[PDB]
Design a protein around this ligand. Sequence first.
Ligand SMILES: Nc1ncnc2c1ncn2[C@@H]1O[C@H](CSCC[C@H](N)C(=O)O)[C@@H](O)[C@H]1O
Ligand SMILES: [Mn+2]
Length: 870
Amino acid sequence: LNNCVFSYLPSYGDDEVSVYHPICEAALNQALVNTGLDSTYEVVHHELVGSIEADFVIKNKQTKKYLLIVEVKRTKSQVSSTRYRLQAQSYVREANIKVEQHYYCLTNLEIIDFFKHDPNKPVVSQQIIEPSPIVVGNFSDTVSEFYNRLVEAFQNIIDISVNDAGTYKSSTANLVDILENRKDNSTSWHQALVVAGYEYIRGVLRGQNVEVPTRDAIYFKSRPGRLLEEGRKIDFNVLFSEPEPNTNDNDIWNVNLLSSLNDLGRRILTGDELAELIHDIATRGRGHEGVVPTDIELGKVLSIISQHILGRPLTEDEVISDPAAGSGNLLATVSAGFNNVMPRQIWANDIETLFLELLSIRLGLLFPQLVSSNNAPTITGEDVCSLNPEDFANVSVVVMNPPYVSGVTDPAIKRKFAHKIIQLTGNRPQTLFGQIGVEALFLELVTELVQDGTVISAIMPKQYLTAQGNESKAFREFLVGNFGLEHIFLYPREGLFEEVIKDTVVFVGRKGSSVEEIEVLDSFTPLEQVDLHNLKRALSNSSNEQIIQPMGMELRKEKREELENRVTVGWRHITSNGRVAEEWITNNLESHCIRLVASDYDLRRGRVGNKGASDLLFINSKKKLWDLLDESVPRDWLYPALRKVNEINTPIFNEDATPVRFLCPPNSAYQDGTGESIILDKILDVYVDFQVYKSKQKKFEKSKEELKEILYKESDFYSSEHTVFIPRALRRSARAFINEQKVFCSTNALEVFGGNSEEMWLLLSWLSSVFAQLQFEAMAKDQEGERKLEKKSIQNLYIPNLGDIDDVLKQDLIEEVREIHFFDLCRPRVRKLDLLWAKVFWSGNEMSKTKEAAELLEDLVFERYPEGSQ
Ligand SMILES: Nc1ncnc2c1ncn2[C@@H]1O[C@H](CSCC[C@H](N)C(=O)O)[C@@H](O)[C@H]1O
Ligand SMILES: [Mn+2]
């Protein structure tokens, strides 16, 4: 009977996992029972698929293959969004051979969109399957009717998937086609959007009991000028402008397509569907791109933060602006969070004129009860460098996801922004130093353009927080200057093939202010899990003394003086990433480990080559000397050596690991009469002559007698079998190695010794894991550039209790070392070695705790050394 156990339907602001997921899960299960497919298929919540986690999969019990992937979102605008449709599609691409059928689904429960991934036709809107979009209802509906309809829709979708009976929606496809062919013709592009938009707008508005002109577009086919006038009576001036459609248009006067668009409007009741569809096609000369991909969850949080920095109500004359509006998603989301805004207070601008219509459509239908011929958003298609302070006079809040170009700045773009800033301020840009990015110039230009007190919220690459180039230094100077930084928001973002990523940040300023303490807001939780009601109240209750933390987040305060004085070095000190990692290590690793210093092992800095004559000790390190000497040195006098920690690149430190050699003559080479002493005399002779050759005065004083003694001494600093070596300085590779035979090590590495073969290989296996590396990055929480750790800090590393690993596993752990290289710290990946080690610490859950360490490591490394991720 579909008996519902739920008392309420969600609110858009409810935590997705806590509130939406149980409803969706109960419905999927019921759908399997109703059709009797529960004998064959199971519902799995949070299914790990490669490096990502799916909200729901319908999974075959016997084969473990995927019938259907279901991704849940909170809002209708999210379901319409190409970004989130690509995220859902990604699960099918990541599952590949584990797939039964290529069907996937995106839903906020109110609306279900149903798709079939086809690798030979990857464009999302080409993949919508009939009868999407399925309108289940609205969250203000009676729960039981709504729940029943949810169950029936899932039943339909499951039946179609299991039989591979899906059919691609043709109208969507026909409209995509029409627009793709008009992309390079602004006249016909616009003409198509006039007709299509008229029909879609009328559907959205009629479904919401808003009065619309009663005649359908096709009625005006012979008099299209009338279509323009009929549209203007609703609003959307920039859409309902010239040029008129042509009567002779071979594509747009199609009853089927036009009805379909009107119906689509009736179904969605939002401007989002059509706007996203247009944006996909228009944004094909990409880019067009900005700092982050579409993030509606972020936009919702930004809205709350903006209002809190504003610190007062927005009056009726005050405007909310996005000067590089793009798709309109961010402006639409942020605007919607201001109760009582009028359509006339929203201003969207973008240089790309192909976005004009879609911006009109999205933002005009945003407030469907209010939009009219006298009350509509302003939509402009101007380069920011053409705008003037007067254009921003009424602007009280700016939000932006500024243009970003992942590569090398176009100098003509650079110049165009710089001149405009010079013109406005009389001075060069505060940000234009080093290898400038357009995003910083854009932000600075907008800042100069607005009035004091204007709230400016900008999404920026996180590198700006922590990087040490002159461009990041100048940027932080800008932030605590004119920009009037008040708030820093740190959050995790979602990627196509990566669950969480901390590579972006939000900077919120109030122009011309100089607040004493700057807010730092850190979300430990993905933004979909943030209860928006809790956050609203946490920010506005946080008085002077008592700082109230929102759930899954920490709010802290930093003194401006501290950021001002730490502008060259960076603001890494403000992030919590190092603290949580220290906590994670303590709650998960410490009980089963001991500190290296407590253990039986000895620690010692590499001894070789500390007291000069490096070029002789490492006979083959210098090419010109070696071109001379190579024919003169017996191969068995050469021992594998470490000078620069860089030259090894493998866990096994032997002759095959490195070409670098140390010169160790045998004992008989030092006594007189033998042939060995002869061989050595020859060598030293040629060495002396080359030192002359290199000398400007053709002089070298030091005798063979002395060189003999140095070589004899340094020979005694060899490293015993099964030493494990720790580089003192690393950039990007997780480096640790072991030797099997006698080697020589420079001062550039730390030596660990004392154990036996097995104890030593196990320690190497540990050092090669994400867990040991995590600990290193934690000790280095206050560093930039290379990670430099000496005996002092490494003494304190936690190493696993020897008597805690089972003998089979010990054998698996050592073995695994034999089949790895050095993992990339900027992009760690969970692998057998880590999972193996995970068995020592956890029964629940190996994968998920190993996946956490990996993510924490990645985030810490991104702070210390960004460039490895670009
Ligand atoms: N020089 C310039 N002046 C004004 N706007 C610009 C610009 N260069 C790029 N832009 C715009 O900056 C935008 C990046 S932001 C991407 C917008 C995103 N869809 C959203 O909802 O926020 C692009 O749309 C691009 O057209
Ligand atoms: Mn979800």
